Design an enzyme around this catalytic site. Structure first.
Site: not given
Ligand SMILES: Cn1nccc1C(=O)NCc1cccs1
Length: 281
Positions: A214, A180, A220-221, A261
């Site tokens: 994602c 998370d 994440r992608s 990110q």
């Protein structure tokens, strides 16, 4: 070489600084179609838009818009579609895009619920006998089989164009253990997952581009595509250490904004590529 560069930034703790230089160097292109008021409810996040030049167009005359970008890595001979986790009202558009682009694989790097909020609509069937129909795009989706492992799930899906009665098999690769908060401690299970997608043939030029998502389709992608492309370039080049992650990331950012990110995701991308290089040399 990146192993030495890794120790330098790590020992000096300069990750936030490297990350800021990437942010400042990154391309900025118009996203006019994404900002049209008729497309407001097709975007999960108002600050995450595909560029007009690289956006995927749906083949429907009404509204061709989906929040999805084609990332074309010319030297590596790899394409990827990066998209947001579908919304309740875009699940049908998502599967129309998969159909129209001839994709063989969907890579999902998020859970449907994270931090107690919905990050994605439930866009695939949970049981063999309960298929999903998308009336707006005239597609039927059936779960054929599901193989649940510790770190990921692979699902075989049948997608049927109700208009032409053609059917295709789609593979759904669902990485289920990204925490998370933050990034995985070790890149081992992520690399294992990436090698499993490669082994399926989903990343091969025979097929349309893999769809990767994602929640926003940038963090994440981004890590997924960056690691795959960097490792492939190390196979292809006479000098494997000529591969500069930062350059590859900047080239990918010409196609979709914001890929990677956080400084943590950047560090994790280095670690994944450094570790993956051992299995490739
Ligand atoms: C209807 N609308 N007006 C402004 C923005 C929206 C919108 O639907 N945005 C996407 C999401 C819907 C539910 C979670 S995120």
């Amino acid at each position: 070489e990146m192993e030495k560069e890794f120790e330098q930034i790590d020992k000096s703790g300069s990750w936030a600084a490297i990350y800021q230089d990437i942010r400042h160097e990154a391309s900025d292109f118009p996203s006019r179609v994404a900002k049209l008021p008729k497309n407001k409810n097709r975007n999960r996040y108002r600050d995450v838009s595909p560029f007009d030049h690289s956006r995927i167009k749906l083949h429907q005359e009404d509204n061709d818009y989906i929040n999805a970008s084609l990332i074309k890595m010319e030297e590596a001979q790899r394409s990827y579609i990066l998209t947001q986790g579908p919304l309740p009202n875009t699940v049908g558009h998502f599967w129309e895009m998969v159909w129209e682009q001839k994709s063989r694989g969907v890579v999902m790097l998020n859970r449907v619920m994270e931090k107690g909020s919905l990050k994605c609509a439930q866009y695939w069937p949970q049981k063999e006998e309960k298929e999903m129909i998308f009336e707006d795009t005239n597609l039927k989706l059936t779960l054929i089989s599901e193989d649940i492992k510790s770190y990921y799930t692979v699902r075989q899906l049948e997608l049927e164009n109700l208009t032409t009665q053609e059917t295709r098999e789609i593979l759904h690769f669902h990485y289920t253990t990204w925490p998370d908060f933050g990034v995985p401690e070790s890149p081992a299970s992520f690399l294992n997952f990436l090698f499993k997608v490669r082994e399926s043939g989903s990343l091969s030029p025979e097929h349309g581009p893999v769809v990767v998502h994602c929640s926003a389709g940038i963090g994440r992608s981004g890590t997924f595509c960056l690691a795959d492309t960097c490792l492939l370039l190390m196979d292809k080049r006479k000098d494997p250490s000529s591969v500069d992650i930062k350059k590859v990331l900047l080239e990918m950012r010409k196609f979709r904004m914001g890929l990677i990110q956080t400084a943590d995701q950047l560090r994790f991308s280095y670690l994944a590529v450094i570790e993956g290089a051992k299995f490739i040399m």
